[PDB]
Amino acid sequence: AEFVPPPECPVFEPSWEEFTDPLSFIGRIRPLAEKTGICKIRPPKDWQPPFACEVKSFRFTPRVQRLNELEAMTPREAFGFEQAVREYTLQSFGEMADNFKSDYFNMPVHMVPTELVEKEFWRLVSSIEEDVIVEYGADISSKDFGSGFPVKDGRRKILPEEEEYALSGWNLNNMPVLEQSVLAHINKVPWLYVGMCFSSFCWHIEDHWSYSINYLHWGEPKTWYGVPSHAAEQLEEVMRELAPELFESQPDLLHQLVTIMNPNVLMEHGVPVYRTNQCAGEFVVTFPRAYHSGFNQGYNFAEAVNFCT
Ligand SMILES: O=C(O)c1ccnc2cc([C@@H](OCCN3CCCCC3)c3ccccc3Cl)[nH]c12
Ligand SMILES: [Mn+2]
């Protein structure tokens, strides 16, 4: 009955020499990592970038996420107004997030096992008897309050010991983003995610089947699921069979806004799925056309960007 965790995706711990160039390292791990869709990369222990966002002015209105909204399609009074609108700071969002999780599980937030949050998340997504609603500070542009990484744009002070991170190839602002094309001759910044427990992102691939790289600056883990690109059509077939019929005729760009699916459903239909808990200071790389989804274990802060090889 309970959720069965998928097998773990690969985790790499590159040496300082291997960590010098990200594209070179990603190219070398590709024979394994492209067979799992996602992989996790732990930087050397001494690689600890500062957090460079404008914290005092960081303000946002997160999106409301009803975990069982797809199951609820199977109408409620005054639907469309089920939640009051609240703006947060980083501090007040974290206070709300910690209070939600500790109240939900009746224990301190860091004492909740990651396996329990995972099992509860997937139970709540399919539950009609229990309507859990959370909030996600998603798709916050790094242009609003700055990137989480230090950047030498003369908009924020950079200490001397922080300059190496402003210049690092693993700084998401220094990843290559310009795709080659003939139109580029005739004629892209990172996004931020402030998570709370159960906030989530559903199955999707990137525009132009791009790679993506994801960094968890701080907080509780982000739980990932990934499908290798050689099974992309298998996943899409399972979606065609079991996703809500009302959304069946929708293009992929719109379908991937809403369509959540339990990883066990994909696995029972022969789709390979891998998981990982991305912890603070760790990278997750998604490979071209690798479907991925996930949810946050608690209050955290992530940064993501598509990159080109
Ligand atoms: O939250 C994470 O850590 C996370 C990790 C990896 N990939 C994604 C993708 C999303 C989101 O894409 C929303 C779409 N915007 C994307 C960038 C700005 C423009 C349009 C998303 C997709 C489905 C459901 C919810 C969410 Cl927030 N979140 C992700
Ligand atoms: Mn993505």
Domain annotation for the chain: domains and CATH numbers: 1-309 (2.60.120.650)
Ligand nearest to the CA of 139: 1
Q: Cα 216 to chain center, whole Å?
A: 9
Q: Two tokens at 282? A: 């760790």
At which residue do the structure tokens 């080659």 appear?
A: 180
Cβ–Cβ contacts within 10 Å for residue 249, how many?
8
Q: Does 204 appear as a known binding residue?
A: yes
Distance 159 CA to ligand 1 centre (A): 32
Q: Assess contact for 275 and 263: CB atoms under 8 A.
A: yes
This structure was determined by X-ray
Task: Give the torsion through C-alpha atoms of 199, 205, 210, 215, to 10 deg.
Answer: 20
Q: Assess contact for 295 and 268: CB atoms under 8 A.
A: no
Q: Which of 162, 270, 206 is nearest to 38 (CA)?
A: 206
End-to-end Cα spacing for the chain: 42
Long-range contact pairs involving 93-101 (C-beta distance under 8 Å, separation at least 24):
93/60, 93/62, 93/135, 93/137, 93/194, 93/196, 93/299, 94/299, 96/135, 96/196, 97/195, 97/196, 97/197, 97/298, 97/299, 98/298, 98/299, 100/134, 100/196, 100/197, 101/196, 101/197, 101/298, 101/299
Q: Cα 233 to chain center, whole Å?
A: 22
Sequence-separated (6 or more) residues with CB below 8 Å from residue 7: 273, 274, 275
Cβ–Cβ contacts within 10 Å for residue 7, how many?
11
Q: Count how many Cα atoms sit within 13 Å of the Cα of residue 180 in the half-sphere of its side chain.
A: 2
**CB of 213 shorter than 6 A to ligand 1:** no
- Hey, which of 204, 247, 257 would you mutate to test ligand 1's pocket, going by the most ligand atoms within 8 Å of its Cβ? 204
Residue type, 12: F
At which residue do the structure tokens 């990159």 appear?
A: 307
The bridge status of strand 38-41 relative to strand 11-12 is: parallel
Ligand nearest to the CA of 137: 1
Distance, CA of 38 to CA of 226 (rounded, Å): 5
Distance, CA of 292 to CA of 271 (rounded, Å): 13
Sequence-separated (6 or more) residues with CB below 8 Å from residue 135: 62, 63, 64, 65, 86, 93, 96, 196, 199
**CB of 28 shorter than 6 A to ligand 1:** no
**CB of 302 shorter than 6 A to ligand 1:** yes
Q: Which of 258, 195, 260 is nearest to 222 (CA)?
A: 195
Long-range contact pairs involving 266-269 (C-beta distance under 8 Å, separation at least 24):
266/227, 266/235, 266/238, 267/4, 267/6, 269/234, 269/238, 269/241
Distance 138 CA to ligand 1 centre (A): 7
Cβ–Cβ contacts within 10 Å for residue 188, how many?
11
Q: Cα 89 to chain center, whole Å?
A: 21
Ligand nearest to the CA of 257: 1
**CB of 283 shorter than 6 A to ligand 1:** no
